[PDB]
C-alpha cells in the first residue's frame, strides 16, 4: 500500500540526521506508527503485535543511537499487550479477573501447566487513543518538573549546567524565575565543538529573563566547582540502571567532579526518554562523531589522528535524583517505572529469537 | 525549481587502474568494502534527484546486474534509475550531443563525472545557482570545488589554476599546469584582453576538482553546435569563456569542507583514510547503510561487523576495518588497513596501510605494506610483499616469493 | 555578583602607557606585545624570552652621567618589569629569575669600567639559563627516561614545557615504542603546538579534546605526565586550567600521574582553594555576526575564563625534579635545602 | 542574610487567636498549649494525643440545626486542625491520620441518627490506633527482637517512640543482657525521658551528650537504633536533629545503623538537601542576667536552631517495619504496595 513507502522514508530520514534530539524523533515515529495502525490488516491481535514489532526491529536496527524512536514503540506494544490479559481473564467463567496491578515477577512463570466480549476492531481505536494520550503526555512533561523540583532547590545557590541544549532545563529555569521568585545564577559550560552554538544561545535566552548568568569554558569548571552547590542535567535517554545517555558533551567528567566534591547532581527527564534496555557495552550506546570540527587544518600527510565524542554516559553512582513528570526517584528506582510502562517481552525486540 | 534531473558519467578513468578494471569497471570497486557507485548515489539522492543516466562504456552487463540487484530498482527509490549502453571508450562531451540527439533532459541537472565522496549540503548549492539565475541571464553553470588550502602539490594527476572573481566567484579563466616531478615547465599565461571589466580576481591552486557541475538545459544546446570539444574542462570551460560565444558566463562555487573525487591510488589511499577516519562527517562508515552491514565503532577508529573472529594475542591499531565472517590468527598485526569480508588471515602477518578486499586467504608469516589485494587473490607462506603492489583479481601466489615496488602483478 | 569573583583585581586590564619618563627598550615592547596579544608561551618559554631580552637590555647599557652602574640598574630594570606587569601577570619562573638577577646586581662593586659588566652579567645570566634551566632539564630527561617502559602511552596536557624533549628523547633517541596522547582546551590551543612538533618528528601522536576526556582513559592507558607552572609549598600543583580534571580522572581510574618540574619553579607561597590567586584572561577570546556579540550592553550576562587552577596533592603520584623523584607532600624540604642554596 | 535561611516561612510564629468564629474545643486548646509551650512529645505521642483528643471532639458532637453530620464535620475538624497548625507544624503521623480520618468521614451516609456515629467513628478510630499504631509496634518488637544478640550495647538517640518498648522487652521480657547508651541534645533534653524510664525498669543505661559523641564509639559498641519522624520517598531519613551526625559516625566506624519505623510514617514527598523543608523552633530556648540577653537590639547577631534534618540513605543499614526488614533505597515499594492499601 501507501504505508510501506512511508516507513522507509522515515527510516531514511532518521539515518542521515534530518531529525535529531529526543522530542522530535519521538513525535515523528509516533506519527509514523499512527499512520501504520490506520492501515493495518491483522485478523488477530497476536498477529498485530508481530506487525508492529517487526517495524520496531527494522527501525531500531536502522539507528540504535537514538532511543526515543525505540521506546515509544515498546511502550505502545506494552499498552496493547496489557489489554490482552484484562480481556482474557474476564472472558473465562471459572476465575474471572484478579484485577491486581502488582505481581511477583519471578514465580508465576515457574508454575505453568501449559456483551463487549471480543469486538474485533477495538484494538485499533485503543491504539489510536494510546497514540493520543502519548501525545498528550510528551507535549507537557515540564509541568511535573516545575511542580516538584522547586521543592528540591533552594534560593541563594549558584548553579551549574553542562547540558545547555535541552528545552526541559530551559523552560524550568525560566519558570523558576517567572512564577516563583527564587533568584540565583547559572554557570554554564560549552561542549566544544558542539554546544558552542547552543550554550551561547542558552546564555542569551537566560539573559533575556536576566538570571545573573555567566558562561564558563570546559577547562575552567574544576576551579569553579568548589563554589557551585549543584549541577543539573538535561539528559536524552536514561536506562534501567539510571545510567543516562546525555546530549553533546561535558557531562561524563563534570558530573564526576560533582561526585568527588560531594555536590548533588540533578537529572530532569521526560517519561518518554526511558528505555527498558541495559548498557551492555557502554561504547555501543555512545555516538562518537566526526573529526572535522575539532581541528580545521585537515592534515594531509602528517595526519595526526584524533577522536571526537557527541555522547557522554554517566553511571548511576555519579547521579543523585531523577526529576520526572511522575515524581522524584532514586537512580536505583528507575527499573520499576520501566516495568510499569514496559514488559519483559519487548526488550529483545526481534523476531529471530536466538 | 523542483523535479531535479541528473546524469552520472563514469568509465573515463580506465587508464588509471589498468592492472585491475579490465574485469569490472572503476565504478564497481570497493572503496570501503562496498563498490563506490552508492558513494555518489546516496549523495545525489540526498540532493533529491528524480532520474539518473548511467553511462557504461565498458562491462555494461556487470553494471546492470548490480543495478537491478540494487536498492534502486525497487518502487520507493527517490529517483528512478536508467542506464545508457555504449560502444567502447567514448570521449566525454559527445555523450551530451548523443543525449541532445535523443532529447530527454529538460531543466537543471548534475554533470557528476567520475566517482565522488562528499559531505556538502547540495541544498545550499541550489540558492547559489538561483542567485546566479536572478543576477545573471547569461549564466552557464556552477562548479563546486573544495578548499584544500593546507596542501598543494599532492593532488596527483592534474593541477589546475581556477582563476575566478573576487565578488561573484565567476570563473574567469582556466589552464592546465604541470607536475612537481617536472622542474622544466615553468610558466602559465593569462592574456588580459578578456580581463577588461573584471577589476578584481583571484587565482588559486588549492581547489581540487570534483566534477560536480549543475547547469541549465540551455548549455547542452550550446554544446551541440561547437563539436570540437572532447574533455569537460581542459577544452570546454576554456573554450566557452575565451570570448568564443558572447554573453555566456560560467560560475564556480567554493565550499568550506570535504568534497573529493577519485583520481588514482595516490588519491584512493588518501580518500580511503579520510572516509575511514572521522574526516567525513556525517557520511561515515559505521552507520551501516549500503548493503546492510553491521559495523560497530570502538575508539582508535576500529570497524568490525558481526561474526568477526579475532584470534587471541592479536593487536589491531589505528584506522582499520574488518568485514564479517573473517578469521585472523595468532601473532598478526593490523594497522591503518581495510580488510574485506569473509577472508582467511593466517599467522603472524603485519598488515599495514594495505586495502585487502573480499575473500583473500592470506598465508602465514607474509607481511604486507601498501599491497592492496583484490578479490579472491590468495597468498601463501612467507610471501613478503612491499610497497606499491596493486596485485589484482584472483591471483594465485606460491610460497616464499618476494615482490618489488609498484609491481602491478595480475 | 553572587560570588563576585569576576571583580578580582589580581590582573589589571589597563593598557597603552604613553609616558616617556624612562627609556623603555623597543625590544621589550616587542616582547610585551608578543606576550599579551597572541600568547605563544608556557612558563619557561616566558622565562627564556624574558631572560634573553634582559640579555639585550643589559647589553645596551646607556648609563647616565653621575650615577654608578650599581645604583641605577635595578630601578631601570624594575621599570622594564612594569611593562610586563601590565602585559601579563608573572610566573614563578619570572620571579625567581628576577630576584636572583637583582641579588646578582647587588654584589657588583663600583669599579667596573662598563666593559667587564658584560663579562659578569651576560656570561653569568647565560650560566643561569644553562644551569637552572637547560641542563636541569637535561637531568629531567635522564631521570624520567628510566620510568617509561616500551610500548606504552602518555597523556600530556596543553603545551608541555620540558617534557616535549622527554617524549622526543624516548621516541627517537632511545627508539622505544610510545603512543603519545595530547589533549588541550579552549581557547589557547597549545596542545597543537606539541602535536605538530611530535608528529613532525614521527611519533604516534593522537590529539584529542578535554570534552571527550572519558574515551581516552577507556583505552590502554597509563603514565599521565603534566607540565607545571609552579608547585606550591603544600604540594598543590599550579598549571594551565583543565589540568586538574584529568588529574582527578587519572587518579580515579588508578593510573599514575607525574609532574616534570625543576627546582627553579617551586614557590614559597601557599593556597589550597582554586579560585583564590588566579588570572582572568581577556573574555573576548571565548566567542570565536558571531555566535554572540556583546556580553556587555546585555544586563545579567558574563563570560569568565581561568588560566590557573590547583590539583590537590592526593592526585600527583610523583613530582620529578633534577635532584630526583619525590612525593608532592615533601616539596618544602626542597624549598628549604636546595632552592637558592644550589 | 548571606544564606537567608532564618526567613523561611514554613513556620509562622503568630499567636493568640482571639476569634470566636467557631466552637474551638477547650480540650484542643489544652492540647495545643501542651504541644507548643513545653514540648513533651515525639511523633507518635503527638499522633496518639491528636487521635485521642479528636476522639473527645467527635464524642462531643453538638450538631447544628439544618446541616447533616456528613456535611459539617470535615470543615469543623479542619478548623480544629488550624489551631494545631498555629501551634506546631504537623508530622506525617499527623497527616496520614487526618487524611485517613477525612476519607472515613466521607464514606458515612446521611442516615445516622447521631447515635451510631459513635459506633462507627469512636470504635473505628480506636481500631486505627490499634492497627496502624499499637499492634504494628508489637510487630516491630517481635521483628527486631531477633536481631539483637545477648550482652551487646545499643546507641539510641533523643526520645525513642517505639523502641523504648523494644529495649524494655529485650531487657526484661527476654532477659538477655544489654547495655543501652542514650544520647540526646540541647535544648529538648528528651533522652532523659528514656533514661529515667529504662533505668527505673532496671537496665544498664549510660546517658551521654552528643558533644562527647567520639568516646561512645571507642568502646565496645554496635547496633545503633534510631527513631524516625518520617522516611522520605528516596530513602532519606527525617528525625530530630543531631541524628545524622551519629549516623555518619556510626557508618564511618563500620557498626550497623537501624531505624525502627512503621508503615504509617512513610511519606510521599521528596527532598535530598537538609535545610530545605524544616522547622525553626523558638530561639529563646538556646539561652537557658543570663549568658546573653537580646539577640535582638544588637545588630548582626542571630540565634538559629533546627529540629529536623536528613540522614542520607547510604548510612542506614536497615529500615525495619511491621511487614519486615528492607533496604532504605526500597521504601517506594512499600509506598506503593502497602501504605493505604493495608
Backbone phi and psi for residue C309, each to the nearest 5 degrees, phi listed first: -150, 170
Beta pairing class for A244-245 and A237-238 = antiparallel
Tell which residue, B223, B220, B250, has the closest CA to residue B138: B250
d(CA B155, CA B180): 10
- Please tell me the distance in Å from C221's CA to the nearest CA on chain B: 12
Give the minimum alpha-carbon distance from C203 to chain A in angstroms, rounded to a whole number: 10
Please count the other Cβ atoms lying within 10 Å of the Cβ belonging to residue A238.
Answer: 28
Contact A292 B278 (CB under 8 A): yes
Measure the CA angle with vertex D90, ends D86 and D94; round to 5°. Answer: 125
Question: B298 and A283: CB-CB below 8 Å?
Answer: yes
Q: Chain A: nearest CA to B287, how far in angstroms?
A: 8
Q: In 3D, which of D161, D282, D281, D164 has the Cα closest to residue D229? A: D161
Beta strands A322-324 and A327-329, pairing class: antiparallel
Q: Does C219 sit within 8 Å of B300, measured CB to CB?
A: yes
Q: Which of D256, D232, D233, D257 is nearest to D243 (CA)?
A: D257
Determine the structural domain holding residue B251 and report its residue range: 5-276
Rounded Cα distance between B273 and B276, Å, is 5
List of residues 6+ apart from C76 with CB closer than 8 A: C22, C23
Distance (Å) from the C-alpha of residue B113 to the closest C-alpha of chain C?
Answer: 36
Q: Which of D68, D87, D41, D79 is nearest to D227 (CA)?
A: D41
Name every residue in C having a CB less than 8 A away from some CB of B: 204, 206, 215, 218-219
> Contacts of residue B318 in chain C, CB cutoff 8 Å?
204, 206
Q: Say yes or no: B299 contacts chain C, CB-CB below 8 A.
A: yes
Give the max Cα distance, chain D: 69
Cα–Cα distances (Å) from D289 to B139, D286, D292, D293, in that order, read 101, 15, 8, 7
Evaluate whether D33 touches D25 at the Cβ level (below 8 Å).
Answer: no
Neighbours of A181 (CB within 10 A): 8
φ, ψ of residue B214 in degrees (nearest 5): -120, 135
Cis bond upstream, residue A234 (ω within 30): no
In Å, how far from its chain's centre is CA B202? 27
Q: End-to-end CA distance of chain D: give it in Å, rounded.
A: 47
Q: Which three cell numbers stand for residue B289?
A: 547503510
CB contact under 8 A, C214 and A158: no
Contact C209, A192 (CB under 8 A): yes
CA atoms of B64 and B55, how far apart (whole Å)? 11
B148 and A8: CB-CB below 8 Å? no
Of C199, C211, C292, the CB nearest to A192: C211
Q: Say yes or no for a CB contact (<8 Å) between C206 and A306.
A: yes
CA gap A66, A336 in Å, rounded: 22
Give B-chain residues touching A289 at CB under 8 angstroms.
Answer: 278, 281
Distance between A192 CA and the closest CA of chain C, angstroms:
7
B123 touches chain A (CB under 8 A): no
> DSSP string of C173-239?
IS---EEEE-EE-SS---HHHHHHHHHHHT---EEEEGGGHHHHHTSS---EEEE-SEE-SSS-EEE
Put simply, the answer to whether A289 touches B46 (Cβ < 8 Å) is: no
CB contact under 8 A, C211 and A203: no
The DSSP-derived string for C58-87 is HHS----SS--TTTTHHHHHHHHHHHHHHH
Query: Which chains sit next to A, with 3 or more Cβ pairs under 8 A?
Result: B, C, D
Please give the grid coordinates belonging to residue A41: 490488516
Provide the 10 A C-beta neighbour count for residue A100.
Answer: 6
Kindly report the nearest CA distance between residue B176 and chain A, in angstroms.
23
End-to-end CA distance of chain C: 47
Q: Could you tell me which chain B residue has the CA closest to the CA of A5?
A: B76
Pairwise CB contact (< 8 Å): C218 & B299: yes
In contact, D229 and D308? CB cutoff 8 Å: yes
**Alpha-carbon span D131 to D123, nearest angstrom:** 12
Please state, in angstroms and rounded to a whole number, the distance separating the CA atoms of residues D224 and D248.
Answer: 11
Q: At what angle do helices B218-225 and B94-102 cross, to 10 degrees?
A: 110
Measured in angstroms, the CA of A245 and the nearest CA of chain C are apart by 14
- Whether the Cβ atoms of residue C84 and residue C90 lie closer than 8 Å to each other: yes
**What pairing do the DSSP bridges indicate for beta strands D237-240 and D308-309?**
antiparallel
All residues of chain A having their beta carbon less than 8 Å from the beta carbon of residue B297 are 283, 288
d(CA A232, CA A75): 27
Subunits in contact with chain B (3 or more CB pairs closer than 8 Å)? A, C
Approach to solving = cryo-EM
- Do residues A153 and A320 touch, judged by C-beta distance below 8 A? no
B47–chain A nearest CA distance, Å: 12
Per the listing, cell 560531594 goes with A262
DSSP string, C224-290: EEEE-SEE-SSS-EEEETTHHHHHHHHHHTT--EEEE--TTSB-S----SSSSS--B--TTTTT---
* Residue B352 in contact with partner chain A when CB distance is under 8 A: no
For chain A, domains (ranges, CATH) are 3-139 (1.20.120.420), 141-340 (3.40.50.10470)
At D41, give phi and psi (nearest 5°): -130, 170
At CB < 8 Å, which residues of chain A contact B? 4-5, 8-9, 15-17, 63, 283-284, 288-293, 297-301, 303, 305-308
Query: Please, are residues A91 and A70 in contact by the beta-carbon 8 Å criterion?
Result: no
CATH number at residue B54: 3.90.550.10
- Residue C151 sits at the vertex; the CA angle it makes with C146 and C157, to the nearest 5 degrees, is 75
C-alpha to C-alpha distance for A8 and A13, rounded to whole angstroms? 8
Mutation for testing the A interface, residue in C6, C188, C198, C212 having most A CBs under 10 Å: C212
Closest Cβ opposite residue D234 in set A102, A154, A330:
A330
Give all chains having 3 or more CB-to-CB distances under 8 Å with chain D: A
Closest alpha carbon to A316 in A228, A221, A245: A245
What is the DSSP annotation of B223-270? HHH-TT--SSSSSHHHHTTSSSSTT-B-B-EE-SS-EEE--SHHHHHH
Find the largest Cα–Cα distance for chain B: 71
What residues contact residue D164 under an 8 Å CB cut-off, 6+ apart?
Answer: D194, D197, D198
Peptide bond into C129 cis (omega under 30): no
Which residue in B300, B315, B317 has the most chain C C-beta atoms within 10 A of its own C-beta, making it the best mutation to test that interface?
B300
Chain A positions touching B301 (Cβ under 8 A) are 305
Q: State the Cα–Cα distance between residues A256 and A265, nearest whole angstrom.
A: 10
Nearest-CA distance A322 → chain C (Å): 23
The runs of H, that is alpha helices, within chain A are 4-15, 23-37, 45-62, 68-91, 122-138, 142-148, 167-178, 199-208, 251-260, 335-341
Q: CB–CB of B258 and A298 under 8 A? A: yes
- Distance between CA atoms of residues B241 and B243, nearest Å: 6
Interchain touch B–C (≥3 Cβ pairs closer than 8 Å): yes
Say if CB D238 and CB D308 are below 8 A apart: yes
Asked whether the beta carbons of residue D234 and residue A148 sit closer than 8 angstroms, the reply is no
CA distance B353 to chain C (A): 15
Is A332's CB within 8 Å of D4's CB? no
Report d(CA A28, CA A9) in Å as an integer. 12
Query: What residues in A contact C210, CB-CB < 8 Å?
Result: 218-219, 253
Please indicate whether, in this complex, the C-beta atoms of A292 and B279 are within 8 angstroms of each other.
yes
Bridge pairing between strands B338-339 and C308-309: unpaired
Quote the DSSP letter at residue A339. H
**Structure's resolution in angstroms:** 3.9
Please answer yes or no on whether A306 and C187 come within 8 Å at the CB atom: no
The A-side interface with D (CB below 8 A) comprises 102, 148, 151-152, 154-156, 264, 320-321, 327-330, 332-333, 336
Alpha carbon of residue B206 to chain centroid: 18
Q: Which residue has the cell 554496635?
A: D222
Interface of B with C in 98-157 (CB under 8 A): none
To test the contact with chain C by mutation, choose from A160, A182, A217, A315 the residue with the greatest count of C C-beta atoms within 10 A, namely: A217
Contact exists between C and D (3 or more beta carbon pairs < 8 Å): no
Cα–Cα dist B57/B10, whole Å: 8
Grid cell of C265 as nine digits: 619553579
Contact A156 D4 (CB under 8 A): yes
A235 vs A273, B47, B410, C67, CA distance in Å? 8, 33, 56, 71
Let me know: does B328 contact B344? Beta carbons within 8 Å. no
Residues 6+ apart with CB under 8 A from C139: C322
- Cβ atoms of C31 and C84 within 8 Å: the answer is yes
Alpha helices in B75-202 (DSSP H): 94-102, 123-135
Chains A and C touch (3+ CB pairs under 8 A): yes
Q: What is the CA radius of gyration of chain C?
A: 22
CA distance C114 to chain A (A): 49
Amino acid at each position: 500500500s501507501d504505508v510501506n513507502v512511508t516507513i522507509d522514508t522515515f527510516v531514511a530520514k532518521l539515518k542521515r540526521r534530518q531529525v535529531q534530539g529526543s522530542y522530535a524523533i519521538a513525535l515523528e515515529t509516533l506519527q509514523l506508527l499512527m499512520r501504520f495502525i490506520s492501515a493495518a490488516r491483522w485478523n488477530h491481535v497476536n498477529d498485530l503485535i508481530e506487525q508492529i514489532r517487526d517495524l520496531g526491529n527494522s527501525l531500531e536496527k536502522a539507528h540504535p543511537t537514538a532511543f526515543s524512536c525505540g521506546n515509544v514503540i515498546r511502550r505502545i506494544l506494552a499498552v496493547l499487550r496489557d489489554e490482552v490479559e484484562e480481556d482474557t481473564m474476564s472472558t473465562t467463567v471459572t476465575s474471572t479477573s484478579v484485577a491486581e496491578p502488582l505481581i511477583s515477577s519471578m514465580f508465576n512463570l515457574l508454575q505453568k501447566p501449559e456483551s463487549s466480549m471480543k469486538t474485533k476492531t477495538d484494538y485499533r481505536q485503543v491504539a489510536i487513543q494510546g497514540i493520543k494520550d502519548l501525545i498528550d503526555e510528551i507535549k507537557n512533561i515540564d509541568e511535573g518538573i516545575q511542580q516538584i523540583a522547586i521543592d528540591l532547590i533552594h534560593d541563594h545557590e549558584i548553579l551549574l549546567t553542562p547540558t545547555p541544549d535541552s528545552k526541559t532545563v530551559l523552560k524550568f529555569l525560566i519558570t523558576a524565575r517567572e512564577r516563583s521568585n527564587r533568584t540565583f545564577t547559572v554557570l554554564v559550560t560549552e561542549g566544544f565543538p558542539n554546544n558552542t552554538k547552543n550554550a551561547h544561545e542558552f546564555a542569551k535566552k537566560l539573559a533575556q529573563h536576566n538570571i545573573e548568568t555567566l558562561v564558563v569554558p570546559d577547562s575552567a569548571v574544576f576551579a569553579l566547582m568548589s563554589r557551585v552547590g549543584k549541577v543539573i542535567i538535561g539528559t536524552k535517554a536514561v536506562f534501567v540502571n539510571g545510567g543516562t545517555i546525555s546530549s553533546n558533551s561535558g557531562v561524563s567528567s563534570v558530573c564526576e567532579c560533582a561526585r568527588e566534591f560531594r555536590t548533588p547532581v540533578f537529572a530532569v527527564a521526560g517519561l518518554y526518554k526511558l528505555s527498558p534496555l541495559y548498557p551492555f557495552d557502554v561504547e555501543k550506546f555512545v555516538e562518537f562523531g566526526g573529526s572535522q570540527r575539532i581541528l580545521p587544518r585537515m592534515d594531509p600527510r602528517k595526519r595526526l589522528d584524533t577522536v571526537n565524542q557527541i555522547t557522554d554516559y554517566v553511571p548511576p553512582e555519579n547521579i543523585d535524583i531523577y526529576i520526572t513528570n511522575v515524581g522524584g526517584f532514586n537512580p536505583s528506582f528507575i527499573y520499576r517505572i520501566a516495568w510499569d510502562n514496559y514488559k519483559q517481552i519487548d526488550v529483545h525486540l526481534d523476531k529471530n529469537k536466538a | 525549481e523542483d523535479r531535479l534531473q541528473a546524469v552520472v558519467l563514469t568509465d573515463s578513468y580506465e587508464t588509471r587502474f589498468m592492472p585491475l578494471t579490465a574485469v569490472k569497471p572503476r565504478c564497481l570497486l570497493p572503496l570501503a568494502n562496498v563498490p563506490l557507485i552508492e558513494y555518489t548515489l546516496e549523495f545525489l539522492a540526498k540532493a533529491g534527484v528524480h532520474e539518473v543516466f548511467l553511462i557504461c562504456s565498458s562491462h555494461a552487463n556487470q553494471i546492470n546486474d548490480y543495478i537491478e540487484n540494487s536498492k534502486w530498482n525497487l518502487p520507493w527509490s527517490p529517483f528512478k534509475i536508467t542506464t545508457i549502453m555504449s560502444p567502447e571508450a567514448r570521449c566525454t562531451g559527445d555523450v551530451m550531443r548523443d543525449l541532445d540527439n535523443r532529447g530527454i533532459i529538460t531543466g537543471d541537472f548534475i554533470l557528476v563525472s567520475g566517482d565522488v565522496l562528499t559531505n556538502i549540503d547540495f541544498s545550499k548549492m541550489l540558492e547559489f545557482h538561483k542567485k546566479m539565475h536572478l543576477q545573471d541571464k547569461d549564466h552557464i553553470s556552477t562548479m563546486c570545488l573544495s578548499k584544500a588550502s593546507t596542501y598543494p602539490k599532492t593532488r596527483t594527476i592534474e593541477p589546475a589554476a581556477f582563476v575566478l572573481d573576487k565578488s561573484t566567484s565567476r570563473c574567469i579563466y582556466y589552464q592546465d599546469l604541470p607536475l612537481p616531478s617536472s622542474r622544466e615547465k615553468t610558466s602559465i599565461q593569462i592574456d588580459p584582453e578578456l580581463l577588461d571589466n573584471v577589476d578584481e580576481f583571484v587565482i588559486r591552486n588549492d581547489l581540487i576538482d570534483c566534477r560536480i557541475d549543475i547547469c541549465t538545459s540551455h548549455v547542452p544546446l550550446i554544446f551541440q553546435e561547437n563539436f570540437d570539444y572532447q574533455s569537460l574542462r581542459t577544452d570546454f570551460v576554456k573554450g566557452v569563456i575565451s570570448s568564443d560565444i558572447l554573453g555566456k558566463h560560467i560560475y564556480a562555487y567554493l565550499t568550506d569542507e570535504y568534497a573529493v573525487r577519485v583520481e588514482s591510488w595516490q588519491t584512493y589511499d588518501t580518500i580511503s583514510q579520510d572516509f575511514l577516519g572521522r574526516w567525513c562527517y556525517p557520511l561515515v562508515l559505521d552507520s551501516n547503510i549500503q548493503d546492510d552491514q553491521t559495523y560497530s565503532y570502538e575508539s582508535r577508529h576500529i570497524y568490525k561487523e558481526k561474526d568477526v573472529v579475532l584470534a587471541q594475542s592479536c593487536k589491531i591499531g589505528k584506522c582499520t576495518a574488518i568485514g564479517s565472517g573473517t578469521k585472523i590468527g595468532e601473532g598478526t598485526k593490523i594497522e591503518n588497513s581495510v580488510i574485506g569480508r569473509n577472508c582467511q588471515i593466517g599467522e603472524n602477518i603485519r598488515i599495514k596501510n594495505s586495502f585487502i578486499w573480499d575473500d583473500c586467504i592470506i598465508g602465514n608469516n607474509s607481511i604486507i605494506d601498501h599491497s592492496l589485494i583484490a578479490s579472491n587473490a590468495t597468498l601463501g607462506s612467507n610471501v613478503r610483499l612491499n610497497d606499491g603492489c596493486i596485485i589484482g583479481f584472483n591471483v594465485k601466489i606460491d610460497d616464499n616469493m618476494d615482490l618489488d615496488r609498484n609491481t602491478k602483478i595480475s | 555578583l553572587e560570588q563576585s569573583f569576576d571583580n578580582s583585581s589580581l590582573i589589571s586590564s589597563v593598557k597603552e602607557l604613553l609616558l616617556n619618563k624612562d627609556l623603555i627598550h623597543p625590544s621589550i615592547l616587542l616582547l610585551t606585545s608578543h606576550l599579551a596579544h597572541y600568547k605563544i608561551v608556557g612558563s619557561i618559554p616566558r622565562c627564556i624570552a624574558m631572560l634573553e631580552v634582559f640579555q639585550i637590555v643589559i647589553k645596551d647599557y646607556q648609563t647616565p652621567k653621575g650615577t654608578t652602574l650599581s645604583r641605577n640598574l635595578t630601578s631601570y630594570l624594575s621599570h622594564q618589569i612594569d611593562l610586563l606587569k601590565k602585559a601579563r601577570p608573572l610566573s614563578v619562573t619570572m620571579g625567581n629569575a628576577i630576584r636572583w638577577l637583582k641579588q646578582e646586581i647587588s654584589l657588583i662593586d663600583p669599579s667596573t669600567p662598563d666593559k667587564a659588566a658584560k663579562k659578569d652579567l651576560c656570561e653569568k645570566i647565560g650560566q643561569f639559563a644553562k644551569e637552572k634551566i637547560e641542563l636541569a632539564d637535561q637531568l629531567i630527561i635522564d631521570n624520567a627516561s628510566t620510568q617509561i617502559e616500551e610500548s606504552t602511552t602518555i597523556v600530556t596536557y596543553g603545551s608541555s614545557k620540558v617534557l616535549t624533549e622527554l617524549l622526543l628523547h624516548n621516541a627517537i633517541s632511545l627508539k622505544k615504542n610510545i603512543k603519545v596522547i595530547v589533549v588541550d582546551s579552549r581557547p589557547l590551543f597549545e596542545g597543537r603546538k606539541m602535536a605538530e612538533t611530535l608528529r613532525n618528528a614521527g611519533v604516534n601522536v593522537m590529539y584529542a579534546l578535554i570534552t571527550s576526556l572519558d574515551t581516552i582513559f577507556n583505552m590502554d592507558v597509563d603514565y599521565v605526565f603534566l607540565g607545571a607552572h609552579s608547585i606550591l609549598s603544600n604540594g598543590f600543583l599550579y598549571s594551565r586550567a583543565g589540568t586538574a580534571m584529568l588529574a582527578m580522572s587519572a587518579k580515579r581510574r588508578n593510573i599514575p600521574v607525574l609532574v616534570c618540574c625543576e627546582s627553579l619553579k617551586f614557590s614559597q607561597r601557599v593556597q589550597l582553594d582554586s579560585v583564590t590567586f588566579n588570572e582572568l584572561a581577556d573574555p573576548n577570546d571565548l566567542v570565536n555576526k558571531n555566535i554572540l556579540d556583546g556580553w556587555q550592553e546585555l544586563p545579567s550576562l558574563n563570560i569568565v575564563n581561568i588560566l590557573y587552577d590547583l590539583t590537590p596533592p592526593e592526585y600527583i603520584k610523583k613530582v620529578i625534579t633534577e635532584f630526583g623523584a619525590l612525593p608532592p607532600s615533601s616539596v618544602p624540604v626542597i624549598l628549604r635545602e636546595y632552592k637558592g642554596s644550589a
